[PDB]
Amino acid sequence: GLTGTGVLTPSSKRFQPFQQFGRDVSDFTDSVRDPKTSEILDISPCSF
Amino acid sequence: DTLYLTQDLFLPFYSNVTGFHTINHTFGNPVIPFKDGIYFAATEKSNV
Structure with missing residues (x-):
């Protein structure tokens, strides 16, 4: 159920x-x- | 590496426990009140 937006990478x-x-x-x-x-690590800052 | 509180139903540290030493001539089973959750220990030899 967890939405969000970013960049996915292993743990x-x-x-x-x-x-x-x-x-x-x-x-x-x-x-x-x-x-x-x-x-997976989830870094939601794509970039800003 | 968080330092995370919570407020919840807990066993207090250093608290009074009504330990019931039962031995080969002592049986210990009265009726006991619940009273907001119980902490429990069963020290055994092969978990009896």
Whole structure:
């Protein structure tokens, strides 16, 4: 359900099996996993 | 590397626990009130 806009790139995880979202430093998404198990860093600033 | 609070139903640190030492001549099972969630420990040998 998480919309957004940016740039996708692979991860550096010790990710948990039950877990999904990433909210990095101050509730800011930054890191996700696919519905089909691809854990990706999500940098929404394309650029500005 | 967050420093993230939350306010939630918690076990307080350093708190009084009504430990019930049951041994080979002591059975311990009264009726106990729930009272907003219980913390529980079952130390066992092969998790009985």
